[PDB]
Scaffold this active site. Structure first.
Site, PDB file in Angstrom:
ATOM      1  N   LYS A  34       0.821  -1.210   0.000  1.00 23.59           N
ATOM      2  CA  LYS A  34       0.000   0.000   0.000  1.00 23.59           C
ATOM      3  C   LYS A  34       0.854   1.258   0.000  1.00 23.59           C
ATOM      4  O   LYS A  34       0.629   2.141  -0.821  1.00 23.59           O
ATOM      5  CB  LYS A  34      -0.957   0.012   1.198  1.00 23.59           C
ATOM      6  CG  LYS A  34      -1.905  -1.169   1.259  1.00 23.59           C
ATOM      7  CD  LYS A  34      -2.924  -1.032   2.390  1.00 23.59           C
ATOM      8  CE  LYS A  34      -2.311  -0.965   3.771  1.00 23.59           C
ATOM      9  NZ  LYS A  34      -1.406  -2.121   4.083  1.00 23.59           N
ATOM     10  N   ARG A 109      -9.998   1.100   9.062  1.00 22.19           N
ATOM     11  CA  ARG A 109      -9.524  -0.229   9.443  1.00 22.19           C
ATOM     12  C   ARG A 109     -10.648  -1.144   9.986  1.00 22.19           C
ATOM     13  O   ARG A 109     -10.371  -2.287  10.374  1.00 22.19           O
ATOM     14  CB  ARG A 109      -8.325  -0.138  10.400  1.00 22.19           C
ATOM     15  N   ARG A 148      11.610  -5.412   5.472  1.00 20.88           N
ATOM     16  CA  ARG A 148      11.268  -3.999   5.359  1.00 20.88           C
ATOM     17  C   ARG A 148      12.179  -3.057   6.176  1.00 20.88           C
ATOM     18  O   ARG A 148      12.442  -3.272   7.377  1.00 20.88           O
ATOM     19  CB  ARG A 148       9.814  -3.733   5.735  1.00 20.88           C
ATOM     20  CG  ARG A 148       9.283  -2.454   5.087  1.00 20.88           C
ATOM     21  CD  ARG A 148       8.394  -1.590   5.950  1.00 20.88           C
ATOM     22  NE  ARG A 148       7.363  -2.279   6.727  1.00 20.88           N
ATOM     23  CZ  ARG A 148       6.124  -2.457   6.310  1.00 20.88           C
ATOM     24  NH1 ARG A 148       5.766  -2.063   5.101  1.00 20.88           N
ATOM     25  NH2 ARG A 148       5.226  -3.017   7.104  1.00 20.88           N
ATOM     26  N   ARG A 181      10.959  -0.948  11.516  1.00 19.95           N
ATOM     27  CA  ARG A 181       9.769  -0.576  12.272  1.00 19.95           C
ATOM     28  C   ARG A 181       9.612  -1.507  13.480  1.00 19.95           C
ATOM     29  O   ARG A 181       9.727  -2.724  13.310  1.00 19.95           O
ATOM     30  CB  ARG A 181       8.519  -0.621  11.373  1.00 19.95           C
ATOM     31  CG  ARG A 181       8.356   0.582  10.462  1.00 19.95           C
ATOM     32  CD  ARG A 181       6.912   1.004  10.461  1.00 19.95           C
ATOM     33  NE  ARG A 181       6.269   0.862   9.149  1.00 19.95           N
ATOM     34  CZ  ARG A 181       5.178   0.136   8.913  1.00 19.95           C
ATOM     35  NH1 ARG A 181       4.601  -0.549   9.895  1.00 19.95           N
ATOM     36  NH2 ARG A 181       4.653   0.092   7.694  1.00 19.95           N
ATOM     37  N   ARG A 192      -1.023  -8.198  14.204  1.00 25.35           N
ATOM     38  CA  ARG A 192      -1.448  -7.233  13.191  1.00 25.35           C
ATOM     39  C   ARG A 192      -2.272  -7.918  12.085  1.00 25.35           C
ATOM     40  O   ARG A 192      -3.314  -7.390  11.671  1.00 25.35           O
ATOM     41  CB  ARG A 192      -0.220  -6.535  12.584  1.00 25.35           C
ATOM     42  CG  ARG A 192       0.352  -5.425  13.446  1.00 25.35           C
ATOM     43  CD  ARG A 192       1.829  -5.173  13.194  1.00 25.35           C
ATOM     44  NE  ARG A 192       2.138  -4.613  11.877  1.00 25.35           N
ATOM     45  CZ  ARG A 192       2.203  -3.314  11.608  1.00 25.35           C
ATOM     46  NH1 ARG A 192       1.944  -2.420  12.554  1.00 25.35           N
ATOM     47  NH2 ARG A 192       2.518  -2.896  10.388  1.00 25.35           N
TER      48      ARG A 192
HETATM   49  N1  LIG Z   1       5.116  -5.857  -5.317  1.00 22.04           N
HETATM   50  C1  LIG Z   1       6.100  -6.108  -4.418  1.00 22.04           C
HETATM   51  N2  LIG Z   1       6.910  -7.193  -4.537  1.00 22.04           N
HETATM   52  C2  LIG Z   1       7.891  -7.464  -3.660  1.00 22.04           C
HETATM   53  N3  LIG Z   1       8.168  -6.664  -2.615  1.00 22.04           N
HETATM   54  C3  LIG Z   1       7.459  -5.533  -2.385  1.00 22.04           C
HETATM   55  C4  LIG Z   1       6.361  -5.179  -3.290  1.00 22.04           C
HETATM   56  N4  LIG Z   1       5.834  -4.036  -2.816  1.00 22.04           N
HETATM   57  C5  LIG Z   1       6.536  -3.685  -1.717  1.00 22.04           C
HETATM   58  N5  LIG Z   1       7.538  -4.554  -1.495  1.00 22.04           N
HETATM   59  C6  LIG Z   1       8.453  -4.581  -0.331  1.00 22.04           C
HETATM   60  O1  LIG Z   1       7.799  -5.340   0.692  1.00 22.04           O
HETATM   61  C7  LIG Z   1       7.485  -4.518   1.810  1.00 22.04           C
HETATM   62  C8  LIG Z   1       6.056  -3.993   1.631  1.00 22.04           C
HETATM   63  O2  LIG Z   1       6.015  -2.638   2.086  1.00 22.04           O
HETATM   64  P1  LIG Z   1       4.764  -1.625   1.990  1.00 22.04           P
HETATM   65  O3  LIG Z   1       4.545  -1.152   0.591  1.00 22.04           O
HETATM   66  O4  LIG Z   1       5.040  -0.533   3.010  1.00 22.04           O
HETATM   67  O5  LIG Z   1       3.458  -2.468   2.447  1.00 22.04           O
HETATM   68  P2  LIG Z   1       2.240  -1.877   3.347  1.00 22.04           P
HETATM   69  O6  LIG Z   1       2.270  -0.376   3.139  1.00 22.04           O
HETATM   70  O7  LIG Z   1       1.019  -2.590   2.819  1.00 22.04           O
HETATM   71  O8  LIG Z   1       2.527  -2.270   4.778  1.00 22.04           O
HETATM   72  C9  LIG Z   1       8.523  -3.401   1.722  1.00 22.04           C
HETATM   73  O9  LIG Z   1       9.754  -3.832   2.294  1.00 22.04           O
HETATM   74  C10 LIG Z   1       8.696  -3.193   0.229  1.00 22.04           C
HETATM   75  O10 LIG Z   1       9.981  -2.671  -0.154  1.00 22.04           O
HETATM   76  N1  LIG Z   2      -7.044   3.405  10.832  1.00 17.80           N
HETATM   77  C1  LIG Z   2      -6.484   3.103  12.018  1.00 17.80           C
HETATM   78  N2  LIG Z   2      -7.240   2.931  13.133  1.00 17.80           N
HETATM   79  C2  LIG Z   2      -6.676   2.617  14.319  1.00 17.80           C
HETATM   80  N3  LIG Z   2      -5.345   2.464  14.494  1.00 17.80           N
HETATM   81  C3  LIG Z   2      -4.479   2.565  13.450  1.00 17.80           C
HETATM   82  C4  LIG Z   2      -5.015   2.914  12.123  1.00 17.80           C
HETATM   83  N4  LIG Z   2      -3.966   2.983  11.284  1.00 17.80           N
HETATM   84  C5  LIG Z   2      -2.862   2.714  12.008  1.00 17.80           C
HETATM   85  N5  LIG Z   2      -3.157   2.471  13.300  1.00 17.80           N
HETATM   86  C6  LIG Z   2      -2.192   2.061  14.359  1.00 17.80           C
HETATM   87  O1  LIG Z   2      -0.837   2.224  13.921  1.00 17.80           O
HETATM   88  C7  LIG Z   2      -0.347   1.019  13.305  1.00 17.80           C
HETATM   89  C8  LIG Z   2       0.125   1.392  11.899  1.00 17.80           C
HETATM   90  O2  LIG Z   2      -0.076   0.387  10.908  1.00 17.80           O
HETATM   91  P1  LIG Z   2       0.229   0.697   9.353  1.00 17.80           P
HETATM   92  O3  LIG Z   2      -1.096   1.182   8.813  1.00 17.80           O
HETATM   93  O4  LIG Z   2       0.662  -0.659   8.837  1.00 17.80           O
HETATM   94  O5  LIG Z   2       1.330   1.734   9.279  1.00 17.80           O
HETATM   95  C9  LIG Z   2      -1.486   0.000  13.386  1.00 17.80           C
HETATM   96  O6  LIG Z   2      -0.990  -1.307  13.696  1.00 17.80           O
HETATM   97  C10 LIG Z   2      -2.320   0.555  14.534  1.00 17.80           C
HETATM   98  O7  LIG Z   2      -1.646   0.276  15.767  1.00 17.80           O
HETATM   99 MG   LIG Z   3      11.305  -4.552  15.228  1.00 20.65          MG
END
Ligand SMILES: Nc1ncnc2c1ncn2[C@@H]1O[C@H](COP(=O)(O)OP(=O)(O)O)[C@@H](O)[C@H]1O
Ligand SMILES: Nc1ncnc2c1ncn2[C@@H]1O[C@H](COP(=O)(O)O)[C@@H](O)[C@H]1O
Ligand SMILES: [Mg+2]
Ligand SMILES: [Mg+2]
Length: 235
Positions: A34, A109, A148, A181, A192
């Site tokens: 995302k 969410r 990541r 992270r 999660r």
């Molecule tokens: N299409 C893909 N194929 C392989 N690896 C990916 C792809 N998209 C993202 N990545 C890698 O995998 C992880 C996914 O990250 P991210 O885009 O932040 O996912 P999300 O935002 O859903 O948590 C990151 O380490 C990124 O560099």
């Molecule tokens: N829409 C949301 N509602 C409630 N808590 C959230 C939300 N987005 C992020 N968080 C909190 O922050 C973290 C961030 O997750 P991410 O969206 O993967 O960056 C989540 O695991 C929750 O602890």
């Molecule tokens: Mg860690």
């Protein structure tokens, strides 16, 4: 800065200005891609990247009672209170970075958050264009989270294997150190993915009923997925 370099900046500028306005939601478990795809659209379509995770981790950095509360919820892999997230989204949606359009990454969410967003969009006279679902299996997500690395100041995303930096654990742009992270720890990623399955998975059906859902195969390479998303928007 040369005349050719000046005219080339305009070519680039007029390419994204000519792209349609868009208000989308990226729905999918952590490690789905995302954030990756949100950074792409920010560059290609000048869409605002509204990440609740980023806004909350920022709120979790504050040395206040509210700060500790958010830091502990985030690090446990659980969801922050619906009313708190709503206020952050309501504020960022007012910023001028959201006038061309936005990407809601991490919001909504749950069903309650989806309803709040719906009421907020109605009152603000703005409409969603689509809800993209990042369909990727659980096994794939495990490895995605493991490797990541992020550059905290820019929010640029890397992967030790799938998207490696030029020099290990250093940003490509600033050559500054990368971070892992705290919520990317094996045990909390498990919690999660559970919270996602229980609270966020019913939104697939919710947005499918609203005839807004667009299914994506998020297991394909990032550059291929970028073109598929851009095709749905500009096509
Ligand atoms: N299409 C893909 N194929 C392989 N690896 C990916 C792809 N998209 C993202 N990545 C890698 O995998 C992880 C996914 O990250 P991210 O885009 O932040 O996912 P999300 O935002 O859903 O948590 C990151 O380490 C990124 O560099
Ligand atoms: N829409 C949301 N509602 C409630 N808590 C959230 C939300 N987005 C992020 N968080 C909190 O922050 C973290 C961030 O997750 P991410 O969206 O993967 O960056 C989540 O695991 C929750 O602890
Ligand atoms: Mg860690
Ligand atoms: Mg289309």
């Amino acid at each position: 800065f040369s005349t050719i370099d000046l005219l080339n900046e305009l070519k680039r500028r007029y390419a994204c200005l000519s792209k349609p306005d868009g208000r989308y939601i990226f729905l999918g478990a952590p490690g789905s891609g995302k954030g990756t795809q949100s950074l792409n659209l920010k560059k290609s379509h000048c869409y605002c990247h509204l990440s609740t995770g980023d806004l909350l981790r920022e709120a979790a950095e504050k040395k206040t009672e509210l700060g500790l509360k958010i830091k502990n919820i985030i690090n446990e892999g659980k969801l922050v209170d619906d009313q708190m997230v709503l206020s952050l989204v309501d504020e960022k949606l007012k910023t001028p970075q959201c006038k061309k359009g936005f990407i809601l990454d991490g919001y909504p969410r749950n069903v309650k958050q989806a309803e709040d967003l719906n009421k907020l969009l109605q009152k603000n006279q703005t409409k969603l264009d689509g809800v993209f679902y990042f369909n990727v299996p659980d096994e794939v997500l495990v490895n995605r989270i493991s490797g990541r690395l992020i550059h905290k100041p820019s929010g640029r995303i890397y992967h030790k294997i799938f998207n490696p930096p030029k020099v290990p654990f250093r940003d490509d742009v600033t050559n500054e150190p990368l971070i892992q992270r705290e919520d990317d720890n094996e045990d909390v990623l498990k919690k999660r993915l559970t919270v996602f399955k229980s609270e966020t998975s019913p939104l697939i059906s919710y947005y499918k009923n609203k005839n807004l859902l667009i299914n994506l195969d998020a297991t394909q390479p990032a550059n291929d997925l970028e073109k598929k998303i851009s095709q749905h928007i500009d096509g």
